Design an enzyme around this catalytic site. Structure first.
Site, PDB file in Angstrom:
ATOM      1  N   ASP A 195      56.698  45.425  41.425  1.00  0.00           N
ATOM      2  CA  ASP A 195      56.699  45.173  42.855  1.00  0.00           C
ATOM      3  C   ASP A 195      55.327  44.863  43.440  1.00  0.00           C
ATOM      4  OD1 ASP A 195      56.262  47.944  42.229  1.00  0.00           O
ATOM      5  OD2 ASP A 195      56.441  48.398  44.380  1.00  0.00           O
ATOM      6  N   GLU A 222      36.192  42.776  41.413  1.00  0.00           N
ATOM      7  CA  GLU A 222      35.855  41.776  42.426  1.00  0.00           C
ATOM      8  C   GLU A 222      35.988  42.417  43.814  1.00  0.00           C
ATOM      9  OE1 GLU A 222      38.370  38.259  42.294  1.00  0.00           O
ATOM     10  OE2 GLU A 222      37.547  37.425  44.174  1.00  0.00           O
ATOM     11  N   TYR A 223      35.005  42.150  44.669  1.00  0.00           N
ATOM     12  CA  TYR A 223      35.021  42.601  46.056  1.00  0.00           C
ATOM     13  C   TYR A 223      35.635  41.506  46.930  1.00  0.00           C
ATOM     14  CZ  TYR A 223      32.815  42.965  50.762  1.00  0.00           C
ATOM     15  OH  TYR A 223      32.537  42.947  52.119  1.00  0.00           O
ATOM     16  N   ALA A 224      36.742  41.839  47.591  1.00  0.00           N
ATOM     17  CA  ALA A 224      37.412  40.935  48.517  1.00  0.00           C
ATOM     18  C   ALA A 224      37.072  41.379  49.936  1.00  0.00           C
ATOM     19  CB  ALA A 224      38.918  40.962  48.292  1.00  0.00           C
TER      20      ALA A 224
END
Ligand SMILES: Cc1cc(Nc2cc(N3CCN(C)CC3)nc(Sc3ccc(NC(=O)C4CC4)cc3)n2)[nH]n1
Length: 257
Positions: free
Chosen positions: A131, A86-88
């Protein structure tokens, strides 16, 4: 339906990491805009993380949540491994912290809610996260937070975001994620993580002792939440439900559970 490199137009570099490059890309037939991470087999093997990546990719594919970056697929050729992601569009929370210095209480509580929702969803699927670093948090087109690393488990490196039980050489469970929320809540509000130091040796000592203080501008409600999350004993950290129901969260968050 197997993908190959020729199925994608490659755009500009998005990020340059240690293991490989991430590119903006568009699948040719559908015109679907996405991110392509390219990794070299020779390099993953030489570091002995090829398997680790396979397990994390397999776990990732099972995850479907508006706040978890989606892995659509993968493939590989002679020398390279390709992750189709997915491209954010709005980039990392890390870069946003650099532009803004620190976040107000409303942005912070919204991000925490979004993180806790994603993590709640993961816990119900027996998926634990390691983390969580800002660099690994992406922003969708409406500015929604997306967990973008692959640090998932089913039951080094900078120390800043690691809990005491992980550095001391102890047994860790789902309570790691709540420590993570504590560190991030603090960093969002203050502009640096609570155990930041100039050296690894000293950061180690600070985390192990839970040695941190608040600047004066941190409000009582934020103080209360962070202090509850940053407990040395994992079993003393609250549940994700309690985080989502915290008065400071409910008073300030733009987004629900
Ligand atoms: C994979 C991915 C990346 C994106 N989007 C972006 C967007 C972005 N921007 C750079 C700064 N401009 C001002 C805004 C857009 N910068 C990065 S820099 C970057 C690159 C990769 C990763 N993370 C990963 O590759 C995850 C899989 C391990 C995080 C940040 N990634 N969408 N999907």
């Amino acid at each position: 339906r197997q993908w190959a490199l020729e199925d994608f137009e490659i755009g500009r570099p998005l990020g340059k990491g240690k293991f490989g490059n991430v590119y903006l890309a568009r699948e040719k037939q559908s015109k679907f805009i996405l991110a392509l991470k390219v990794l070299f087999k020779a390099q993953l093997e030489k570091a002995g993380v090829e398997h680790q990546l396979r397990r994390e990719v397999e776990i990732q594919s099972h995850l479907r949540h508006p706040n978890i970056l989606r892995l659509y697929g993968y493939f590989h050729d002679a020398t390279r491994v390709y992750l189709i992601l997915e491209y954010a569009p709005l980039g990392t929370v890390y870069r946003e912290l650099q532009k803004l210095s620190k976040f107000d209480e409303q942005r912070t509580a919204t991000y925490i809610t979004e993180l806790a929702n994603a993590l709640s969803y993961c816990h119900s699927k027996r998926v634990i996260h390691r983390d969580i670093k800002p660099e690994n948090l992406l922003l969708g087109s409406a500015g929604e937070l997306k967990i973008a690393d692959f640090g998932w488990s089913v039951h080094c490196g900078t120390l800043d975001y690691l809990p005491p039980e992980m550095i001391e050489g102890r047994m860790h469970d789902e309570k790691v994620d709540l420590w993570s929320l504590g560190v991030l809540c603090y960093e969002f509000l203050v502009g640096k993580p609570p155990f930041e130091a100039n050296t690894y040796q000293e950061t180690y000592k600070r985390i192990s002792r839970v040695e941190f203080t608040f600047p004066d501008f941190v409000t009582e409600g934020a103080r209360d939440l962070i202090s509850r999350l940053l407990k040395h004993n994992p079993s003393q950290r609250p549940m994700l439900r309690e985080v989502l129901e915290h008065p400071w969260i409910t008073a300030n968050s733009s987004k629900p559970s």
